[PDB]
Write a protein that binds this ligand. Structure first.
Ligand SMILES: [Zn+2]
Ligand SMILES: [Zn+2]
Ligand SMILES: [Zn+2]
Lengths: 114, 56, 33, 164
């Protein structure tokens, strides 16, 4: 789904079809470089998504003082310290699942058990 | 409010009022009380002009 | 010599605030990280 | 005779392809001609709905999940029954079945709406039925010169009123 660029000249590659050999050949519209396509997938709309609750993590989230602290442990390092905080996505239907990030194992883990 | 830790829905956090009048308040409850009162005052001061127009 | 510090209307979201000088600083009338 | 040869060849293919081999190939083409002659009894190749029931039974056979439909259709479960069944949800398989009833239960629950429950007490008395099942609720309406309204409603019958 990614947007490849011509290695000779960093420009947006477009799909165009072979006339007789029946293959998608990503030809550059700037220069004459051409490349066959790995998959017949071209375009993808994705009208439904549920993604974005997790990321935005820096390696020193716990360096900020404002995050609360708890005593549930990381289930890799067993250290009782932690940093917990809710979803990083905000829709009007995002969940009350929580995200728990530790400093010792430096790992993200949740509290869902379904 | 900037005075609690992050991401809480406790009755203190959103600010359910614990105390009665007589023992006093905490400043957070004082602030929320002022919020609800000010909402009552602004809705009254707009609705009086609108109801006067529609009555006339 | 740096004992008080001006903080504007915009900064406070990097800052936790205490109500009292001993509200939780050590580790009937009324009710009170 | 295009349909009555094509569906017969289809049943030739989907019965020879089975692990249940046809040494009783005359029995199996008897089963196929019985299947097709009850299949036409809905339509006689004169109704557009002929191909739909054929597609249902055909891809139920070629489904896999399940392959056991071939064994039960060769060892029983007769073909004039399986026009009048229309049991496409009911067969092939039962885990997908119990999935569908869980889905239907979930949808029937989620299509229900808002049911705010109106906590009651016996403090006041109704006007219509004069019962102390007051669905009371409290809120402020007027200006600053007064407290709340003391809104009232009876839940035993539906009678709304107000206290002064
Ligand atoms: Zn190029
Ligand atoms: Zn760990
Ligand atoms: Zn009543």
């Amino acid at each position: 789904t990614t947007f490849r660029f011509c290695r000779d000249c960093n420009n947006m590659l477009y799909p165009r079809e072979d006339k007789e050999n029946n293959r998608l050949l990503f030809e550059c519209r700037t220069c004459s470089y051409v490349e066959e396509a790995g998959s017949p997938l071209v375009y993808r709309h994705e009208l439904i998504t549920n993604i974005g609750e997790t990321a935005g993590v820096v390696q020193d989230i716990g360096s900020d003082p404002t995050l609360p602290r708890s005593d549930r442990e990381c289930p890799k390092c067993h250290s009782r310290e932690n940093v917990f905080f809710q979803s990083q996505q905000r829709r009007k239907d995002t969940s009350m699942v929580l995200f728990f990030v530790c400093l010792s194992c430096s790992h993200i883990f949740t509290s869902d058990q379904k | 409010l900037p005075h609690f830790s992050k991401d809480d829905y406790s009755p203190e956090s959103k600010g359910f009022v614990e105390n009665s009048y007589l023992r006093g308040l905490t400043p957070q409850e004082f602030f929320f009380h002022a919020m609800g009162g000010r909402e009552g005052l602004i809705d009254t001061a707009v609705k009086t002009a609108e109801t006067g127009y529609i009555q006339r | 010599e740096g004992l008080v510090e001006y903080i504007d209307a915009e900064e406070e979201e990097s800052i936790l605030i205490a109500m009292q000088p001993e509200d939780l600083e050590p580790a009937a009338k009324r009710i009170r990280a | 005779h295009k349909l009555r040869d094509q569906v017969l060849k289809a049943l030739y293919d989907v019965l020879a392809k089975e692990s249940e081999h046809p040494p009783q190939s005359i029995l199996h083409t008897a089963k196929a001609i019985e299947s097709e002659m009850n299949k036409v009894n809905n339509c006689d190749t004169n109704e557009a709905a002929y191909k739909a029931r054929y597609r249902i039974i055909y891809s139920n056979v070629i489904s896999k999940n399940n392959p056991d439909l071939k064994h039960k259709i060769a060892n029983g479960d007769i073909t004039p029954e399986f026009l009048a069944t229309c049991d496409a949800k009911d067969l092939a398989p039962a885990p997908l079945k119990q999935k569908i009833e869980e889905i239907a239960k979930q949808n029937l629950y989620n299509a229900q709406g808002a049911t705010i429950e109106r906590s009651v007490t016996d403090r006041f008395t109704c006007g219509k039925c004069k019962e102390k099942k007051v669905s009371y609720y409290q809120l402020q309406t007027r200006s600053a010169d007064e407290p709340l309204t003391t809104f009232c409603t009876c839940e035993a019958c539906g009678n709304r009123w107000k206290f002064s």
